[PDB]
Curated annotation (Swiss-Prot), chain A:
It comes from Saccharomyces cerevisiae (strain ATCC 204508 / S288c). This is Proteasome subunit beta type-3. GO terms for biological process: proteasomal ubiquitin-independent protein catabolic process; proteasome-mediated ubiquitin-dependent protein catabolic process. GO terms for cellular component: cytosol; nucleus; proteasome complex; proteasome core complex, beta-subunit complex. The gene is PUP3. Keywords: Cytoplasm, Isopeptide bond, Nucleus, Phosphoprotein, Proteasome, Ubl conjugation. Its main location: cytoplasm. Pfam families: Proteasome (PF00227). Belongs to the peptidase T1B family. Non-catalytic component of the proteasome which degrades poly-ubiquitinated proteins in the cytoplasm and in the nucleus. It is essential for the regulated turnover of proteins and for the removal of misfolded proteins. The proteasome is a multicatalytic proteinase complex that is characterized by its ability to cleave peptides with Arg, Phe, Tyr, Leu, and Glu adjacent to the leaving group at neutral or slightly basic pH. It has an ATP-dependent proteolytic activity. This subunit may participate in the trypsin-like activity of the enzyme complex.
Curated annotation (Swiss-Prot), chain B:
Present with 16800 molecules/cell in log phase SD medium. GO terms for biological process: proteasomal ubiquitin-independent protein catabolic process; proteasome-mediated ubiquitin-dependent protein catabolic process. It comes from Saccharomyces cerevisiae (strain ATCC 204508 / S288c). The modification Phosphothreonine is found at T58. The proteasome degrades poly-ubiquitinated proteins in the cytoplasm and in the nucleus. It is essential for the regulated turnover of proteins and for the removal of misfolded proteins. The proteasome is a multicatalytic proteinase complex that is characterized by its ability to cleave peptides with Arg, Phe, Tyr, Leu, and Glu adjacent to the leaving group at neutral or slightly basic pH. It has an ATP-dependent proteolytic activity. This is Proteasome subunit alpha type-4.
UniProtKB/Swiss-Prot annotation, chain C:
Coiled coil: none annotated. This is Proteasome subunit alpha type-5. The modification Phosphothreonine is found at T47. Signal peptide: none annotated. Its main location: cytoplasm.
UniProtKB/Swiss-Prot annotation, chain I:
Transmembrane segments: none annotated. It comes from Saccharomyces cerevisiae (strain ATCC 204508 / S288c). The proteasome degrades poly-ubiquitinated proteins in the cytoplasm and in the nucleus. It is essential for the regulated turnover of proteins and for the removal of misfolded proteins. The proteasome is a multicatalytic proteinase complex that is characterized by its ability to cleave peptides with Arg, Phe, Tyr, Leu, and Glu adjacent to the leaving group at neutral or slightly basic pH. It has an ATP-dependent proteolytic activity. This is Proteasome subunit alpha type-1. Pfam families: Proteasome (PF00227), Proteasome_A_N (PF10584). The lineage of its organism: Eukaryota, Fungi, Dikarya, Ascomycota, Saccharomycotina. Keywords: Acetylation, Cytoplasm, Isopeptide bond, Nucleus, Phosphoprotein, Proteasome, Ubl conjugation. The modification Phosphoserine is found at S227.
Length: 204, 240, 235, 231, 243, 244, 111, 250, 241
């Protein structure tokens, strides 16, 4: 019944030293039933990355919507949108549905191309921004991710160290949630290179 | 909203805007329709003032309204798109509500009704377009060929032409087309359609388009070489 | 320019008077009412020999007991016929009965003056509405774009109207049979038509209480034409 | 001239030509006569035909059991205005259980016609009406002009050659007003009045149209052999 | 030129010729007047008897708004009725919201704004009437006169129509000869006289006199028509003065 | 009323022409010449800026060549302000199609529609038409490289090479002469610039009086790249082809 | 909560003969256990030799009869004083009733 | 009532001219001279305060207007038309941008929105074109400093320097000789004052001249402290005294 | 020549309907004047009651828009009242929405914007009036702001409007050229009214009785008009020195 927990899923993002990381599970379900193990929840618009948890139809709908809006932004501005600006666009677009909201938990991750500063942010379903320095969590295992991130995270981690921290936070949180798992993906993001790694995890 | 009455009567009982819409049709490229015993052929002129054209992507003169009905026209090109779109929407709407494809007579009556509506509606001008609508009714082997015009009147024709120099090709068809014995085959029907256009067209190269429609949704457009063979045979017989 | 609903100094609506000129250019239509039925006949007037004449539909069914012939800008008649048919059938829905010919005619004429700056101009077509009901029997009406309708024993509209009306003045009497009326319409049509009258360029129809509204076949009309020629040659 | 293109334009002398042209349509229309006593009110109308095969255009329309009118000019405009009266008479009955006063019916027609004379796009009504009725203050006769002017009268006439009938009624004023409790004699005076407006043609059985309303008489129309008595 | 063909168009003078043409329709109409007295107002009007067939005392021209305001006008009669219908709507909405009956100055502006609105667009025609109106409110008696342009002022006496000059001259004499004021019953008598004197400009056809009044003492501040003996007394006084 | 002042923008002449469309075309004939040339391996768009000034900031300027999406571009001839209204509608459009079908919009579908909008202004509404002619250069996987034009009438046609704006009569003759079907982009670039150089009303054709763009499959492997040329890049290609 | 319906009781009876018909009904009007009126007419002459009675909720019954009487009046105006047949009246009443299909007239009707 | 002018009042003539736009440009020509010059580290916009009466307080009438903290505007032509355009330009900067992206629009996009409004008045029903030409100077992070002209047609062009109105032809010639790509802001202000003196007849001082700049951030004009990233508006209107100081070194 | 009937541009770039609306302004043949004191703003206007039948108390071109703002109009009374009613509505709406009294200059701008719309939109005609708004603003002090049919508005040290505005304008110009200040250096408003009347007398060259003038005075937190007897007292003080 609860739209935020029908399909299940999780997203987590972390900052490092001159880098960010964003990760998600691959599960899509109908409550107890597992339907897909290839439902990626992370999308990118230029160099800005967006992870979305919650109701899958709204996840898909919002992706197509932000693709729409960022493509027009670029044609008019003659430049790619930045994370700080995109974060405001997400907030705006969610609050315009204040009394009929998208049942989602978005997470923005990216590096400002000009300043070089790593940036992450999270939202509630109606646009309240959570701009954090350390990490952002979202999904059905958000409580689990908070416990892992808060204990495992330390500032100024290098990309290859940050990878291990975010991966372990995700994996162990997912294994304590019935509605999350069935695969996992981690994006490691630097100012001009991005690596994407699929993790090996238990498939139950 | 803009409500101005543009189409109105004049002292002598004429609606000039509807009559001036017919002048736009007179300017348009020639289009011809000929129905045989078991088929209908639609011929269309392409003015050769425009070369360096990309014939792959250029809007074709004959348009499919459904799988069993086609529509050609003479007059303003942009106006014709609006009629064709409406006709296509209605064709699907008819299938959706009555579970049968439109008859050629029904589709013509709809298109003609749209044209008429634009002759007594405020803020709009008449369509500068006359159409030839051809095809076969579902589960029927009798050929159908109708004509419409800006005023909204429509009628069925054994053979008919519209557009520039249509007076000349109609003259040709009136003496060559026999009702008691129409073109028995596809060849005879296409040949007569090409012959009629050769009275007006100029060159028989890329200026003539032909589209054959047969029963049971069998519609095909002839190529340049196939048409050129008809042009060759006609003139070789003429040299005598 | 000038308003569409403007009065002339003589007290007439310019647009209504101009629409009447368009009707004079239209093909001839004749109606004759008798005690055995009402006959309706029209000139088809094909613009070319290649035009399949049977597709020319200038006589039209409104209901089983009401028919209609037209003259002028015939494209304008389609929405009037549509309204008439809807009115006739809607009344059958609400009242479980046939609708009076006068009431139907009145419903059509209510559209006439709904023009201004609603539609942008008056209709450019006149209608002969013929029918039968239990109250007033066999009736023939002439519906104009002015919104006025007159009942007639016999009436001609179109290009040869005043010549035909003068002929209908002399020929009509209250004891006419249906067969006599059929021949009389054919006689007058043949007189005012440009081309020679035959079964392909002219159409007959009638409305009787028993059989209702019927458009005549070309084979049936052809015999009535042949019957006419012989009776004119008889004296 | 330059000020007759639409109804929204005054002339330099303060005239409204479109309204005056609408008034002209009434003068072209067939004659109709109205007159009343203290007990009854009568309408007499000369109907017009297109030709010998045609019927005679109806001139009188019933609005309620106690009210109705005769027309002169554009008949479709009379149908619109009479329909409006029918609705207003009916609104008064359904809401207030009250028969509409004839004077108030005139005020409503005046106000409806006026809106058409002050606004752009529309046109004035091209018809004149003679309304008769019997209400709580007795018998009544009204004359409606499409300018908006409505006038309560003892008797009157409108249409072509209406001046002849109007003069007759002006002489007969003292006589016909006293015709109380006698409907046939009041109609006779009306038929004799409309006869003063005739030339060439005379009153035949399918030509004449009469209507009456009174104290214990609902609004009824007489046509055909029902008016042969008065010829 | 062409500036007079359309309403709401300024001429090179700065004039609205269409409104000036509407005034010509007012000047063509019958005479109507208003007289402000000690504790109220009196309205009177000339009704031309076009024919003997006109029923006497039936075609009433003076109209009441609410229960305390009287309105009379000269020119196009339907335009006046339209204006009064609006006045009644304005008065009804005022009382609905504010409880108290509409004050006369407040009412005057409601009409003024409405008439003025019909000089702002070419899609409407100006009003073909000058309207004399007034009554009694909490602050006493008020008399107003409103032109086609939307212009209105307060008046001691007012007159409009074909016999306005004759009337105005007579009103000016009353103002001079009665600085302390005029009584309500006197004003009715004087009103009758002025209409009779103003009838010399419409002397072809005979006429019918119609008078109304609002007075704090005589009518309890309510609008009433002058009827019966009081009307006949005023007619007799008027007939005596012309002879 | 208001009827007095209505120009009646959507009516036929006695000859059956649309007055305003014809007059809009007359306006466009005074606009800077724009040329499109389609090759086997790409498309070229060339256009002439109108009598510029030395104080005009060229590198941030855009009056002729606009980007509709990653695959489709347009050259403008006529009122720039009118063109931008239509350009933004076309951009929203391509995005609506992409959101609905999850595929890039076919070129013709985008063209047909801008042309349908233009058509509407000639048939209803009582408004003046858009005084704009477009040359559409685009690519999709159905027809490959495509050139279209649309004008204020709302009529559109496909081309191998085409010009709009000023001196189209002279420009079309020169293109018809030197164009061949087996032509390549580098050759088409040269043809476009040579044609402008001969048809221009200016004394000489320089980098500051030109806007230039190409659509090439000359992108790393099976994909398409749009290149809007910079002022310095236009200056280089003018020297390369041997015009300056 | 506001209940827009009520029950005014009463009973009606229609019997058809060979060349006649009767429509009877009691004259009592009630709410709950109280009597409102001992004589409140419930059967009406609607014109054209038709009698009608709407039994149940009096306010809806009075409104329907009032509307049908009005329908008869306009049938005369629109169709040249033609007599409304009983079968035509019945069909007309169906459309009056079904026009409020989603907020019904709480009455059983007999003509 | 109702607005019954639903048809265009600007239409193409047989020659292809849009008459009302041409006539609007003629109204701009009659208007008082205004100019704009772009420097390396700023932009300057200037105009004459043509006072209608000496009793009128010319300080209350502002020809140079702030649109956003980093964008300013000046005009030539009809003043009332300019005033309403500034009101709409200020509002559209919020509704179509700031309320969406949480930041002020870049110069070119705000100009684009203003241009759109002026184009619509050239095609929509029952309206005339705006009788003004705007010069819009501004700064934004990714485009730097910029100067745009916007005409009655809705067309806009970026300029290094330009002038509009009464003596624009002479003023543009003057600017062509003096302008280079290495100008500092103070040099541009000096050139602006020289250029503007040629078109002015009467008094030439800080009280008769209106001049503003887009330059460095003004933290003193921000109104609050505590947020490092908020450094204040780049738009600044020069005072009467500040102008007179630079007229002594003229 | 339909470019002279509606508000569209002529070939010269002019709006003739706006220019003709300016000419309607002087149709009443009345001259007005406005000046500022230290604590007050005074506005005077000629009063002409030609007809003896008129109630002179109702003849007025000065309006009380709000408690603080007063307005004098130069132009025909129907348009004047149209503007007055609108300004009153706007001033009231402003206070309701924004929680403080509408300033004089803000109201002037708002009315000027409305006037601008009539010069651009075709269906609406310009009002043939010039509106002079006066108050003692809580931020700006004594204030005079004037609006015209073109949609133009500006603040004033002093101002004059009417057929003989130029004569009054120059008279005021010459006074402020001597004193070298932007106002009338006077404590009481009574003496500022006396200044206003005196300088109108000198400029127009006509003497005034109590019924020939109409005076409006703006002080802190209220605007009010003077009665005939208040003006008489003012005229007596002028004559006695
Ligand atoms: Cl505003
Ligand atoms: Mg499991």
């Amino acid at each position: 019944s609860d739209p935020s927990s029908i399909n299940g899923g999780i997203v987590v993002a972390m900052t490092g030293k001159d880098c960010v990381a964003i990760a998600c599970d691959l599960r899509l379900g109908s409550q107890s039933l597992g339907v897909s193990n290839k439902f990626e929840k992370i999308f990118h618009y230029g160099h800005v990355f967006l992870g979305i948890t919650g109701l899958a139809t709204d996840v898909t709908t919002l992706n197509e919507m932000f693709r729409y809006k960022t493509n027009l932004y670029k044609l008019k501005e003659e430049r790619a949108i930045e994370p700080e600006t995109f974060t405001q666009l997400v907030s705006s677009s969610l609050y315009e549905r204040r009394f009929g909201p998208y049942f989602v938990g978005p997470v923005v991750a990216g590096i400002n191309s000009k300043s070089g500063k790593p940036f992450i942010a999270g939202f509630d379903l109606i646009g309240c921004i959570d701009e954090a320095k350390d990490f952002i969590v979202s999904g059905t295992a958000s409580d689990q991710l908070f416990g892992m991130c808060e204990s495992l995270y330390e500032p100024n981690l290098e990309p290859e160290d940050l990878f291990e921290t975010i991966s372990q936070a995700l994996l162990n949180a997912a294994d304590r949630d019935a509605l999350s798992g069935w695969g996992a993906v981690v994006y490691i993001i630097k100012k001009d290179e991005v690596v994407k790694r699929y993790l090996k995890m238990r498939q139950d | 909203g803009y409500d101005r009455a543009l189409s109105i009567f004049s002292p002598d009982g004429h609606i000039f805007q509807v009559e001036y819409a017919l002048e736009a049709v007179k300017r348009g490229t020639c289009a011809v329709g000929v129905k045989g015993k078991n088929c209908v052929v639609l011929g269309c002129e392409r003015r050769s003032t425009l070369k360096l054209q990309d014939t792959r992507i250029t809007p074709s003169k004959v348009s499919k309204i459904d799988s069993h009905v086609v529509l050609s026209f003479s007059g303003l090109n942009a106006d014709s798109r609006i009629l064709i779109e409406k006709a296509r929407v209605e064709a699907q709407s008819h299938r959706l509500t009555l579970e049968d494809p439109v008859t050629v007579e029904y589709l013509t009556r709809y298109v003609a009704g749209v044209q008429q509506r634009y002759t007594q509606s405020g803020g709009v001008r008449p369509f500068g377009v006359s159409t030839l609508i051809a095809g076969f009714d579902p589960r029927d082997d009798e050929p159908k060929l109708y004509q419409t015009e800006p005023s909204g009147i429509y009628s069925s024709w054994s053979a008919q032409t519209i557009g520039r120099n249509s007076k000349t090709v109609r003259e040709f068809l009136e003496k060559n087309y026999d009702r008691k014995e129409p073109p028995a085959t596809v060849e005879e029907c296409v040949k007569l359609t090409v012959r009629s256009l050769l009275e007006v067209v100029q060159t028989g190269a890329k200026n003539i388009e032909i589209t054959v429609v047969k029963p049971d949704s069998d519609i095909v457009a002839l190529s340049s070489e196939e048409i050129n063979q008809y042009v060759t045979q006609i003139e070789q017989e003429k040299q005598e | 320019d000038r308003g569409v609903s403007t009065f002339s100094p003589e007290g007439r609506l310019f647009q209504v008077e101009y629409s009447l000129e368009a009707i004079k250019l239209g093909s001839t239509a004749i109606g004759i009412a008798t005690k055995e039925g009402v006959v309706l006949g029209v000139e088809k007037r094909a613009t070319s020999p290649l035009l399949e004449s049977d597709s020319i539909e200038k006589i039209v069914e409104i209901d089983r007991h009401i028919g209609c012939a037209m003259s002028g800008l015939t494209a304008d008649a389609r929405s009037m016929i549509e309204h008439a048919r809807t009115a006739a059938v809607t009344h059958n829905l609400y009242y479980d009965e046939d609708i009076n010919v006068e009431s139907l005619t009145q419903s059509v004429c209510d559209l006439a003056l709904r023009f201004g700056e609603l539609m942008s101009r008056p209709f450019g077509v006149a209608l002969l509405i013929a029918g039968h009901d239990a109250d007033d029997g066999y009736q023939l009406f002439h519906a104009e774009p002015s919104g006025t309708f007159y009942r007639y024993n016999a009436k001609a509209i179109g290009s040869g109207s005043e010549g035909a009306q003068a002929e209908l003045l002399n020929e009509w009497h209250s004891s006419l049979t249906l067969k006599e009326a059929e021949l009389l319409v054919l006689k007058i049509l043949k007189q005012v038509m440009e081309e020679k009258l035959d079964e392909n360029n002219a159409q007959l129809s009638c409305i009787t209480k028993q059989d209702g509204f019927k458009i005549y076949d070309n084979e049936k009309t052809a015999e009535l034409i042949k019957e006419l020629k012989e009776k004119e040659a008889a004296e | 001239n330059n000020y007759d293109g639409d109804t929204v334009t005054f002339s330099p002398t303060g005239r409204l030509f479109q309204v005056e042209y609408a008034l002209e349509a009434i003068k072209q229309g067939s004659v109709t006569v109205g007159l009343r006593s203290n007990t009854h009110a009568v309408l007499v109308a000369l109907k017009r035909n297109a030709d010998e095969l045609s019927s005679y255009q109806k001139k009188i329309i019933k609005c309620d059991e106690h009210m109705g009118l005769s027309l002169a000019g554009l008949a479709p405009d009379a149908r619109v205005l009479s329909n409006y009266l029918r609705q207003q008479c009916n609104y008064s009955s359904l809401v207030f259980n009250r028969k509409l006063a004839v004077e108030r019916a005139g005020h409503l027609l005046c106000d409806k016609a006026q809106k058409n004379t002050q606004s752009y796009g529309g046109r004035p009504y091209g018809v004149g009406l003679l309304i008769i009725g019997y209400d709580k203050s007795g018998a009544h006769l009204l004359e409606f002009q499409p300018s908006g002017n409505v006038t309560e009268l003892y008797g009157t006439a409108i249409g072509a050659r209406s001046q002849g009938a109007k003069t007759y009624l002006e002489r007969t004023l003292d006589t016909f007003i006293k015709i109380d409790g006698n409907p046939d004699e009041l109609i006779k005076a009306g038929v004799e009045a409309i006869s003063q407006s005739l030339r060439d043609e005379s009153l035949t059985v399918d030509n004449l149209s009469i209507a009456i309303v009174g104290k214990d008489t609902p609004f009824t129309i007489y046509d055909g052999e029902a008016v042969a008595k008065y010829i | 030129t062409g500036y007079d063909l359309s309403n709401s168009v300024f001429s090179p003078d700065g004039r609205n010729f269409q409104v000036e043409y509407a005034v010509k329709a007012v000047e063509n109409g019958t005479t109507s007047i208003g007289i402000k007295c000690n504790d109220g107002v009196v309205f009177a009007v000339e009704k031309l008897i076009t024919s003997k067939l006109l029923v006497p005392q039936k075609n009433v021209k003076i109209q009441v708004v609410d229960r305390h305001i009287g309105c009379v006008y000269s020119g196009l009669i339907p335009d006046g009725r339209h204006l009064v219908n609006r006045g009644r709507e304005e008065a009804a909405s005022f009382k609905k919201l504010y409880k108290t009956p509409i004050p006369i100055p407040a009412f005057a502006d409601r009409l003024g704004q409405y008439v003025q609105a019909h000089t702002l667009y070419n899609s409407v025609r100006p009003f073909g009437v000058s309207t004399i109106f007034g009554g009694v409110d909490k602050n006493g008696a008020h008399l107003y006169m409103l032109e086609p342009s939307g212009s209105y002022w307060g008046y001691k006496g007012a007159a409009t129509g074909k016999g306005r000059q004759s009337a105005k001259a007579e009103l000016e004499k009353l103002v001079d000869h009665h600085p302390e004021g005029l009584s309500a019953r006197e004003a009715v008598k004087q009103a009758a006289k002025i209409i009779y004197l103003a009838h010399e400009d419409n002397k072809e056809k005979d006429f019918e006199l119609e008078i109304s009044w609002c007075s704090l003492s005589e009518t309890n501040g309510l609008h009433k028509f002058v009827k019966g003996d009081l009307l006949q007394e005023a007619i007799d006084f008027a007939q005596k003065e012309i002879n | 009323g208001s009827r007095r002042y209505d120009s009646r923008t959507t009516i036929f002449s006695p000859e059956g022409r649309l007055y305003q469309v014809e007059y809009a075309l007359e306006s466009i004939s005074h606009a800077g010449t724009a040329i499109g040339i389609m090759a086997s391996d790409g498309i070229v768009l060339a256009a002439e800026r109108k009598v510029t000034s030395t104080l005009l900031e060229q590198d941030t300027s855009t009056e002729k060549l606009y980007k509709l999406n990653d695959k489709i571009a347009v050259a403008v001839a006529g009122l720039t302000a009118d063109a931008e209204i239509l350009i933004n509608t076309a951009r929203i459009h391509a995005q609506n199609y992409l959101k609905t079908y999850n595929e890039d919009i076919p070129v013709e579908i985008l063209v047909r529609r801008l042309s349908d909008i233009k058509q509407g202004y000639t048939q209803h509404g009582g408004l003046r038409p858009f005084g704009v002619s477009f040359i559409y250069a685009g690519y999709d996987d159905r027809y490959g490289y495509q050139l279209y034009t649309s004008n204020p009438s709302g009529n559109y046609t496909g081309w191998k090479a085409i010009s709009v704006g000023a001196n189209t009569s002279a420009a079309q003759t020169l293109l018809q002469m030197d164009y061949k079907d087996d032509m390549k982009v580098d050759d088409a670039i040269e043809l476009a610039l040579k044609t402008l150089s001969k048809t221009t009303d200016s004394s000489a054709l320089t980098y500051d009086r030109l806007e230039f763009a190409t659509i090439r499959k000359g992108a790393n492997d099976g994909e398409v790249y749009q290149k809007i040329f910079k002022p310095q890049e236009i200056k280089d290609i003018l020297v390369k082809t041997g015009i300056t | 909560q506001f209940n827009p319906y009520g029950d005014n009781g009463g009973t009606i009876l229609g019997i058809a003969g060979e060349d006649f018909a009767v429509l009877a009904g009691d004259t009592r009007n009630i709410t709950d256990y109280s009597i409102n009126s001992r004589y409140e007419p419930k059967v009406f002459d609607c014109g054209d030799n038709i009698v009608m009675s709407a039994n149940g909720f009096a306010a809806d019954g009075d409104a329907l009869v009032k509307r049908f009487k009005n329908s008869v009046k306009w049938y005369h105006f629109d169709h040249n004083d033609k007599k409304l047949s009983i079968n035509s009246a019945a069909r007309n009443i169906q459309h009056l009733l079904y026009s409020r299909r989603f907020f019904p007239y709480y009455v059983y009707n007999i003509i | 009532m109702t607005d019954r002018y639903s048809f265009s009042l600007t239409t193409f003539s047989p020659s292809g001219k849009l008459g009302q736009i041409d006539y609007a440009l003629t109204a701009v020509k009659q208007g008082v001279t205004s100019l704009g010059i772009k420097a390396t580290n700023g932009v300057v916009i200037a105009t004459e305060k043509k006072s209608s009466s000496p009793l009128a307080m010319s300080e209350t009438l502002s020809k140079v207007s702030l649109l956003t903290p980093d964008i300013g505007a000046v005009y030539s032509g009809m003043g009332p038309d300019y005033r309403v355009l500034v009101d709409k330009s200020r509002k559209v900067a919020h509704t179509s941008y700031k309320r969406i992206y949480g930041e002020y629009p870049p110069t070119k996009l705000l100009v684009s929105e203003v241009a759109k409004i002026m184009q619509e008045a050239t095609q929509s029903g029952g309206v005339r074109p705006f009788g003004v030409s705007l010069l819009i100077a501004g700064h934004d992070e990714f485009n730097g400093f910029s100067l745009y002209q916007v005409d009655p047609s809705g067309s806009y062009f970026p300029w290094k320097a330009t002038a509009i109105g009464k003596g624009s032809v002479a003023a543009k010639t003057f600017l062509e000789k003096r302008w280079n790509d290495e100008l500092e802001l103070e040099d541009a202000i000096h050139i602006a004052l020289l250029t503007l003196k040629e078109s002015v007849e009467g008094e030439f001082n800080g009280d008769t001249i209106e001049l503003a700049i887009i330059g460095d951030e003004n933290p003193d004009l921000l109104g609050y402290t505590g947020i490092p990233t908020d450094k204040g508006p780049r738009f600044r209107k020069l005072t009467s005294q500040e102008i007179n100081d630079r007229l002594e070194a003229l | 020549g339909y470019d002279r009937h509606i508000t569209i541009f002529s070939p010269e770039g002019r709006l003739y309907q706006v220019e003709y609306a300016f000419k309607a302004t002087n149709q009443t043949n009345i001259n007005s004047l406005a000046v500022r004191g230290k604590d007050c703003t005074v506005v005077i206007s000629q009063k002409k009651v030609p007809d003896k039948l008129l109630d002179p108390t109702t003849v007025s071109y000065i309006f009380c828009i709000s408690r603080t703002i007063g307005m004098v109009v130069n132009g025909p009374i129907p348009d004047a009242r149209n503007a007055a009613l609108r300004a009153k509505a706007e001033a009231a709406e402003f206070r309701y929405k924004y929680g403080y009294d509408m300033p004089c200059d803000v109201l002037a701008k708002r009315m000027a914007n409305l006037s601008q719309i009539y010069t651009q939109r075709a269906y609406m005609r310009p009002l043939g009036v010039i509106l002079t708004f006066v108050s003692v603003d809580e931020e700006l002090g004594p204030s005079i702001y004037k609006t015209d049919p073109a949609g133009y508005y500006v603040g004033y040290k002093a101002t004059a409007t009417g057929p003989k505005q130029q004569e009054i304008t120059t008279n005021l110009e010459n006074h402020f050229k001597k004193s070298k200040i932007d106002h009338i250096n006077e404590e009481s408003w009574e003496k500022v009214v006396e200044f206003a009347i005196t300088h109108m007398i000198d400029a127009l060259g006509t003497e005034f009785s109590k019924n020939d003038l109409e005076v409006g005075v703006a002080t802190k937190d209220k605007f009010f008009t003077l009665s005939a007897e208040n003006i008489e007292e003012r005229l007596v003080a002028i004559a006695e020195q």
